[PDB]
């Protein structure tokens, strides 16, 4: 069984900053079958990246994924307010698919 | 076993179904060359050749179905990544599409000859 | 591709729950459908899935013994039956289907998600 682990736990940044999210696997993810999902509050998850680095159509190009083996990163280059959400990684490189525990990215509002 | 060995077998067996049909048509054309073209015989050749096509299409459906089976049996295997099985179903549909299309071509080619 | 789930359901411990998920649009027979749940305020967790063409199932060991996944091909509907419920089974249950490239090549990652179904297991 592959335990996936995300770091940091929480992320506090302003609009326009570059956010970098980490996902690390206890053993190597078979064929780099790692996905990154965005889940806004009260909403179903949205696919951002797959096969480690592939971005599906309709996902803005400010999202990108990289890494192989047991060490993976999602980068959001220029945070827009609507990016405030929890982000999970998933591995589906063996029959028992397992998710990360989640990184919450908090954006901010002018006082 | 492997997921890709399912793909191999499907193609070899589908390719085999299809050249079997071509070969039956080549020999059929040679038998037809010793007969006087006639409108009723022309009606008999087409029926034969179309019915042969169908036998070949059925042979190919069966290969896909058995490949799909083989893909499902790997389902009950922890040593096989279940998330790669879809891809096999897809691959065997693409080979089937190919195999059928090549049968449709070989038929179409032949019917042209019988009526030309 | 649109997935539509059955409605909220309040269950007592020991009861079974059956969640339904209908693919609207898209091809259905050949693409892997997974169920995935989320307890209040917690992480997503994968439960299992099925490829409908020959009901090719895949259960997470921790549910094996309680779970059954099936699909009816004519109605494009997938099914999760969860037996012997417990308060820990209180979550939102999402059905999620794999995405294609561009019918198109399967990618594994869940591109398509249902609206989730709330199952509350209440001792009350």
């Amino acid at each position: 069984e592959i335990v996936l682990t995300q770091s940091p736990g929480t992320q506090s940044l302003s609009p326009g900053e570059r956010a970098t999210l980490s996902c690390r696997a206890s053993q190597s993810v078979g064929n780099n079958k790692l996905a990154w999902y965005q889940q806004r509050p009260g909403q179903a998850p949205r696919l951002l990246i797959y096969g480690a680095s592939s971005r599906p159509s309709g996902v803005a190009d400010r999202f990108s994924g990289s890494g192989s083996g047991t060490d993976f990163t999602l980068t959001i280059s220029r945070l827009e307010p609507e990016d405030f959400a929890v982000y999970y990684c998933q591995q589906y490189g063996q029959s028992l698919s397992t998710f990360g525990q989640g990184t919450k990215v908090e954006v901010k509002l002018v006082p | 076993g492997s997921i890709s060995d399912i793909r191999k077998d499907a193609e070899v067996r589908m390719d085999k179904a299809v050249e079997a049909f071509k070969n039956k048509l080549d020999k059929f054309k040679a038998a037809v060359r010793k007969v006087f073209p006639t409108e009723e015989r022309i009606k008999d050749w087409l029926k034969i050749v179309r019915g042969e096509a169908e036998q070949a299409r059925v042979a190919v459906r069966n290969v896909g179905r058995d490949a799909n089976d083989k893909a499902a049996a790997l389902g009950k295997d922890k040593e096989i990544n279940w998330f790669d099985i879809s891809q096999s179903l897809w691959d065997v549909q693409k080979l089937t599409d190919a195999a059928i299309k090549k049968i449709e071509a070989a038929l179409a080619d032949m019917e042209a000859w019988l009526t030309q | 591709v649109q997935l539509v789930q059955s409605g909220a359901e309040v269950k007592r411990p020991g009861s079974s729950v059956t969640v339904s998920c209908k693919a609207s649009g898209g091809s259905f027979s050949t693409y892997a459908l997974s169920w995935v749940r989320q307890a209040p305020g917690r992480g997503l967790e994968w439960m299992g899935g099925v490829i409908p063409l020959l009901t090719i199932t895949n259960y997470a060991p921790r549910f094996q013994g309680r779970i059954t996944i099936t699909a009816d091909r004519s109605t494009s509907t997938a099914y999760l039956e969860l037996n012997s419920l417990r308060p820990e089974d209180t979550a939102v249950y999402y059905c999620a289907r794999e995405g294609t490239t561009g019918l198109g090549k399967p990618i594994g990652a869940f591109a398509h998600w249902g609206q989730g179904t709330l199952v509350t297991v209440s001792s009350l």
Side-chain angles (χ1 to χ4, degrees), chain A residues 1-11 13-17 19-83 85-107 111, chain B residues 1-3 5-26 28 30-32 34-35 37 39-42 44-46 48-49 51-64 66-79 81-116, chain C residues 1-9 11 13-14 17-19 21-28 30-41 43-80 82-85 87-122 124:
Chain A
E1 187 177 328
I2 306 182
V3 184
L4 284 164
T5 19
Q6 282 172 263
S7 139
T10 312
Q11 198 86 288
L13 297 166
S14 305
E17 287 204 68
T20 100
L21 288 86
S22 197
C23 173
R24 149 172 260 191
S26 38
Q27 65 177 23
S28 183
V29 182
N31 270 306
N32 296 324
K33 297 301 189 58
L34 203 79
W36 283 97
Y37 298 86
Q38 181 180 84
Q39 185 185 41
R40 313 206 160 107
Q43 278 204 332
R46 212 217 166 188
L47 176 59
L48 306 142
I49 298 290
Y50 67 96
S53 48
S54 304
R55 197 183 67 254
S57 284
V59 163
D61 57 38
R62 65 180 192 256
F63 300 107
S64 93
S66 67
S68 50
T70 54
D71 192 23
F72 305 87
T73 313
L74 174 75
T75 288
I76 336 186
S77 48
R78 298 291 187 272
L79 287 178
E80 316 291 83
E82 58 271 19
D83 293 322
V86 172
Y87 294 79
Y88 306 86
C89 57
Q90 178 201 11
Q91 69 79 17
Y92 50 103
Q94 58 175 229
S95 301
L96 178 58
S97 168
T98 60
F99 285 98
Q101 91 279 349
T103 284
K104 167 170 173 181
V105 178
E106 3 185 57
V107 207
Chain B
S2 223
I3 291 193
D5 296 345
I6 293 177
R7 209 234 151 184
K8 252 185 168 98
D9 203 47
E11 189 176 14
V12 181
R13 281 165 75 195
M14 278 174 192
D15 278 351
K16 186 166 154 155
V18 150
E19 295 281 311
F21 167 65
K22 288 178 175 171
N23 293 328
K24 290 204 212 153
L25 269 46
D26 286 318
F28 187 72
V32 159
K34 324 167 188 205
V35 187
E39 202 77 355
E40 203 218 308
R41 276 163 194 177
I42 286 168
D44 278 317
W45 303 342
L46 290 172
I48 291 166
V49 158
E52 281 292 2
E54 180 59 11
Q55 281 170 264
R57 273 182 294 251
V58 165
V60 162
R61 303 291 182 190
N62 296 347
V63 166
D66 194 24
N68 291 339
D69 291 352
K70 231 151 275 163
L74 299 176
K76 331 185 95 182
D77 194 347
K78 206 14 166 268
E79 317 304 282
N81 184 13
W82 175 89
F83 290 86
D84 289 313
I85 297 190
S86 349
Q87 193 173 347
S88 168
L89 294 182
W90 197 76
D91 292 345
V92 168
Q93 168 50 30
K94 280 297 205 162
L95 282 166
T96 283
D97 200 50
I100 303 305
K101 276 195 178 63
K102 297 205 264 196
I103 296 173
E104 305 302 353
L107 175 52
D109 206 284
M110 178 64 186
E111 289 192 8
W113 190 87
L114 286 323
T115 55
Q116 147 234 312
Chain C
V1 181
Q2 199 170 358
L3 302 162
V4 285
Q5 301 197 220
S6 27
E9 226 161 300
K11 283 278 186 284
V17 60
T18 305
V19 181
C21 164
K22 198 195 195 314
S24 329
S27 165
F28 176 82
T30 55
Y31 294 109
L33 188 141
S34 285
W35 287 95
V36 154
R37 76 173 177 191
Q38 193 175 44
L44 294 174
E45 33 169 334
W46 185 85
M47 289 180 53
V50 62
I51 300 165
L53 175 56
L54 292 156
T55 313
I56 302 167
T57 60
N58 175 30
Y59 300 136
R62 68 150 298 191
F63 298 108
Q64 257 148 232
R66 327 210 281 117
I67 219 183
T68 304
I69 302 166
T70 57
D72 183 274
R73 285 217 294 154
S74 56
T75 63
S76 290
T77 306
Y79 288 102
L80 174 67
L82 211 207
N83 297 313
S84 181
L85 292 164
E88 96 197 61
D89 292 315
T90 295
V92 163
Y93 292 77
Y94 294 97
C95 74
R97 209 211 80 182
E98 96 182 306
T100 64
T101 303
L103 206 116
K105 182 191 149 293
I107 80 193
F110 310 139
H112 309 289
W113 287 75
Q115 85 273 2
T117 307
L118 185 50
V119 194
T120 312
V121 189
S122 184
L124 286 141

mmCIF file of all heavy atoms in Angstrom, chain A residues 3-27, unseen atoms left out:
data_model
loop_
_atom_site.group_PDB
_atom_site.id
_atom_site.type_symbol
_atom_site.label_atom_id
_atom_site.label_comp_id
_atom_site.label_asym_id
_atom_site.label_seq_id
_atom_site.Cartn_x
_atom_site.Cartn_y
_atom_site.Cartn_z
ATOM 1 N N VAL A 3 1.303 5.039 0.900
ATOM 2 C CA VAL A 3 0.874 6.158 1.715
ATOM 3 C C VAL A 3 1.413 7.402 1.049
ATOM 4 O O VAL A 3 2.612 7.527 0.841
ATOM 5 C CB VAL A 3 1.394 6.063 3.158
ATOM 6 C CG1 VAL A 3 0.833 7.192 4.005
ATOM 7 C CG2 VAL A 3 1.030 4.719 3.755
ATOM 8 N N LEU A 4 0.501 8.292 0.677
ATOM 9 C CA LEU A 4 0.843 9.588 0.105
ATOM 10 C C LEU A 4 0.741 10.666 1.182
ATOM 11 O O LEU A 4 -0.142 10.645 2.038
ATOM 12 C CB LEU A 4 -0.063 9.907 -1.083
ATOM 13 C CG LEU A 4 0.313 9.117 -2.344
ATOM 14 C CD1 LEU A 4 -0.823 9.163 -3.339
ATOM 15 C CD2 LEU A 4 1.613 9.619 -2.972
ATOM 16 N N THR A 5 1.674 11.605 1.124
ATOM 17 C CA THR A 5 1.850 12.592 2.174
ATOM 18 C C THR A 5 2.073 13.948 1.533
ATOM 19 O O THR A 5 2.954 14.084 0.700
ATOM 20 C CB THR A 5 3.037 12.201 3.078
ATOM 21 O OG1 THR A 5 3.885 11.267 2.389
ATOM 22 C CG2 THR A 5 2.533 11.545 4.347
ATOM 23 N N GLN A 6 1.251 14.934 1.894
ATOM 24 C CA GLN A 6 1.376 16.310 1.371
ATOM 25 C C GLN A 6 1.953 17.329 2.360
ATOM 26 O O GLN A 6 1.648 17.309 3.560
ATOM 27 C CB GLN A 6 0.025 16.829 0.895
ATOM 28 C CG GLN A 6 -0.381 16.301 -0.450
ATOM 29 C CD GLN A 6 -1.792 16.670 -0.799
ATOM 30 O OE1 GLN A 6 -2.707 15.884 -0.606
ATOM 31 N NE2 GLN A 6 -1.977 17.874 -1.318
ATOM 32 N N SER A 7 2.760 18.236 1.817
ATOM 33 C CA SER A 7 3.440 19.266 2.584
ATOM 34 C C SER A 7 3.454 20.571 1.809
ATOM 35 O O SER A 7 3.577 20.551 0.596
ATOM 36 C CB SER A 7 4.878 18.847 2.848
ATOM 37 O OG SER A 7 5.765 19.953 2.694
ATOM 38 N N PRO A 8 3.311 21.714 2.492
ATOM 39 C CA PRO A 8 2.962 21.879 3.889
ATOM 40 C C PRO A 8 1.484 21.519 4.129
ATOM 41 O O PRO A 8 0.798 21.077 3.220
ATOM 42 C CB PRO A 8 3.211 23.369 4.120
ATOM 43 C CG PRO A 8 2.952 23.983 2.816
ATOM 44 C CD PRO A 8 3.489 23.016 1.826
ATOM 45 N N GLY A 9 1.012 21.678 5.347
ATOM 46 C CA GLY A 9 -0.364 21.365 5.648
ATOM 47 C C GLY A 9 -1.260 22.502 5.214
ATOM 48 O O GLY A 9 -2.344 22.271 4.677
ATOM 49 N N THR A 10 -0.793 23.728 5.465
ATOM 50 C CA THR A 10 -1.507 24.955 5.102
ATOM 51 C C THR A 10 -0.557 25.935 4.429
ATOM 52 O O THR A 10 0.654 25.893 4.642
ATOM 53 C CB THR A 10 -2.124 25.644 6.323
ATOM 54 O OG1 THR A 10 -2.830 24.682 7.110
ATOM 55 C CG2 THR A 10 -3.084 26.729 5.884
ATOM 56 N N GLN A 11 -1.134 26.834 3.641
ATOM 57 C CA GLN A 11 -0.389 27.720 2.759
ATOM 58 C C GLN A 11 -1.078 29.081 2.713
ATOM 59 O O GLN A 11 -2.215 29.180 2.266
ATOM 60 C CB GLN A 11 -0.382 27.105 1.371
ATOM 61 C CG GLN A 11 0.654 27.632 0.440
ATOM 62 C CD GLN A 11 1.938 26.895 0.608
ATOM 63 O OE1 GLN A 11 2.634 27.073 1.609
ATOM 64 N NE2 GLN A 11 2.260 26.038 -0.353
ATOM 65 N N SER A 12 -0.399 30.118 3.193
ATOM 66 C CA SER A 12 -0.996 31.447 3.360
ATOM 67 C C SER A 12 -0.269 32.450 2.455
ATOM 68 O O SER A 12 0.877 32.818 2.726
ATOM 69 C CB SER A 12 -0.933 31.887 4.824
ATOM 70 N N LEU A 13 -0.941 32.876 1.383
ATOM 71 C CA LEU A 13 -0.315 33.666 0.314
ATOM 72 C C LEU A 13 -1.280 34.694 -0.273
ATOM 73 O O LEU A 13 -2.491 34.544 -0.168
ATOM 74 C CB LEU A 13 0.196 32.739 -0.808
ATOM 75 C CG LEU A 13 1.294 31.737 -0.425
ATOM 76 C CD1 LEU A 13 1.468 30.668 -1.472
ATOM 77 C CD2 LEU A 13 2.611 32.457 -0.206
ATOM 78 N N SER A 14 -0.726 35.736 -0.891
ATOM 79 C CA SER A 14 -1.510 36.809 -1.504
ATOM 80 C C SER A 14 -1.753 36.494 -2.978
ATOM 81 O O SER A 14 -1.070 35.653 -3.544
ATOM 82 C CB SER A 14 -0.782 38.146 -1.370
ATOM 83 O OG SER A 14 -0.476 38.426 -0.020
ATOM 84 N N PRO A 15 -2.743 37.155 -3.600
ATOM 85 C CA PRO A 15 -2.899 36.997 -5.038
ATOM 86 C C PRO A 15 -1.653 37.465 -5.772
ATOM 87 O O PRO A 15 -1.084 38.506 -5.434
ATOM 88 C CB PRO A 15 -4.087 37.906 -5.378
ATOM 89 C CG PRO A 15 -4.804 38.109 -4.098
ATOM 90 C CD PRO A 15 -3.763 38.050 -3.027
ATOM 91 N N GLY A 16 -1.237 36.687 -6.762
ATOM 92 C CA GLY A 16 -0.057 37.009 -7.553
ATOM 93 C C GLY A 16 1.210 36.300 -7.109
ATOM 94 O O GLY A 16 2.193 36.297 -7.849
ATOM 95 N N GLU A 17 1.197 35.709 -5.912
ATOM 96 C CA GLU A 17 2.341 34.943 -5.424
ATOM 97 C C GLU A 17 2.360 33.610 -6.123
ATOM 98 O O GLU A 17 1.367 33.215 -6.729
ATOM 99 C CB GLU A 17 2.289 34.719 -3.911
ATOM 100 C CG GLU A 17 2.602 35.955 -3.083
ATOM 101 C CD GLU A 17 3.121 35.651 -1.682
ATOM 102 O OE1 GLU A 17 4.245 35.130 -1.552
ATOM 103 O OE2 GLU A 17 2.415 35.967 -0.704
ATOM 104 N N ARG A 18 3.491 32.921 -6.035
ATOM 105 C CA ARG A 18 3.656 31.586 -6.623
ATOM 106 C C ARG A 18 3.575 30.565 -5.508
ATOM 107 O O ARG A 18 4.352 30.616 -4.568
ATOM 108 C CB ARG A 18 4.991 31.489 -7.358
ATOM 109 C CG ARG A 18 5.499 30.093 -7.701
ATOM 110 C CD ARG A 18 7.032 30.121 -7.814
ATOM 111 N NE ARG A 18 7.578 28.985 -8.552
ATOM 112 N N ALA A 19 2.612 29.658 -5.614
ATOM 113 C CA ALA A 19 2.408 28.607 -4.634
ATOM 114 C C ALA A 19 2.998 27.308 -5.169
ATOM 115 O O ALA A 19 2.787 26.962 -6.337
ATOM 116 C CB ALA A 19 0.920 28.439 -4.337
ATOM 117 N N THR A 20 3.736 26.605 -4.311
ATOM 118 C CA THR A 20 4.347 25.319 -4.657
ATOM 119 C C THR A 20 3.927 24.238 -3.632
ATOM 120 O O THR A 20 4.236 24.351 -2.439
ATOM 121 C CB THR A 20 5.891 25.445 -4.765
ATOM 122 O OG1 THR A 20 6.524 24.962 -3.579
ATOM 123 C CG2 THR A 20 6.305 26.894 -4.988
ATOM 124 N N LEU A 21 3.226 23.204 -4.100
ATOM 125 C CA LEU A 21 2.645 22.185 -3.222
ATOM 126 C C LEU A 21 3.327 20.844 -3.388
ATOM 127 O O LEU A 21 3.565 20.421 -4.499
ATOM 128 C CB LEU A 21 1.161 22.007 -3.529
ATOM 129 C CG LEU A 21 0.265 23.150 -3.095
ATOM 130 C CD1 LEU A 21 0.200 24.251 -4.151
ATOM 131 C CD2 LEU A 21 -1.101 22.570 -2.801
ATOM 132 N N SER A 22 3.600 20.153 -2.287
ATOM 133 C CA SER A 22 4.392 18.939 -2.358
ATOM 134 C C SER A 22 3.562 17.717 -2.033
ATOM 135 O O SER A 22 2.651 17.774 -1.201
ATOM 136 C CB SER A 22 5.599 19.017 -1.422
ATOM 137 O OG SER A 22 6.564 18.026 -1.762
ATOM 138 N N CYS A 23 3.882 16.614 -2.707
ATOM 139 C CA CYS A 23 3.276 15.315 -2.429
ATOM 140 C C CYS A 23 4.367 14.273 -2.522
ATOM 141 O O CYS A 23 5.043 14.188 -3.546
ATOM 142 C CB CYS A 23 2.143 15.019 -3.429
ATOM 143 S SG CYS A 23 1.375 13.351 -3.378
ATOM 144 N N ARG A 24 4.545 13.508 -1.450
ATOM 145 C CA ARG A 24 5.599 12.489 -1.364
ATOM 146 C C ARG A 24 5.010 11.130 -1.018
ATOM 147 O O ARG A 24 4.150 11.009 -0.139
ATOM 148 C CB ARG A 24 6.658 12.881 -0.333
ATOM 149 C CG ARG A 24 7.331 11.707 0.384
ATOM 150 C CD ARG A 24 8.516 12.171 1.259
ATOM 151 N NE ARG A 24 9.810 11.962 0.615
ATOM 152 C CZ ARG A 24 10.987 12.079 1.224
ATOM 153 N NH1 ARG A 24 11.062 12.407 2.508
ATOM 154 N NH2 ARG A 24 12.111 11.869 0.542
ATOM 155 N N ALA A 25 5.499 10.109 -1.710
ATOM 156 C CA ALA A 25 4.984 8.759 -1.589
ATOM 157 C C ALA A 25 6.004 7.894 -0.858
ATOM 158 O O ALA A 25 7.201 8.014 -1.092
ATOM 159 C CB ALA A 25 4.690 8.197 -2.961
ATOM 160 N N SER A 26 5.515 7.034 0.035
ATOM 161 C CA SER A 26 6.349 6.110 0.812
ATOM 162 C C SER A 26 7.110 5.129 -0.071
ATOM 163 O O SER A 26 8.254 4.780 0.246
ATOM 164 C CB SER A 26 5.494 5.335 1.821
ATOM 165 O OG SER A 26 4.235 5.010 1.268
ATOM 166 N N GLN A 27 6.468 4.657 -1.139
ATOM 167 C CA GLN A 27 7.173 3.921 -2.198
ATOM 168 C C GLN A 27 6.876 4.554 -3.547
ATOM 169 O O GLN A 27 5.998 5.395 -3.655
ATOM 170 C CB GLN A 27 6.866 2.407 -2.188
ATOM 171 C CG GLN A 27 5.435 1.995 -2.487
ATOM 172 C CD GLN A 27 5.240 0.474 -2.515
ATOM 173 O OE1 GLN A 27 6.007 -0.274 -1.920
ATOM 174 N NE2 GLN A 27 4.204 0.020 -3.213
#
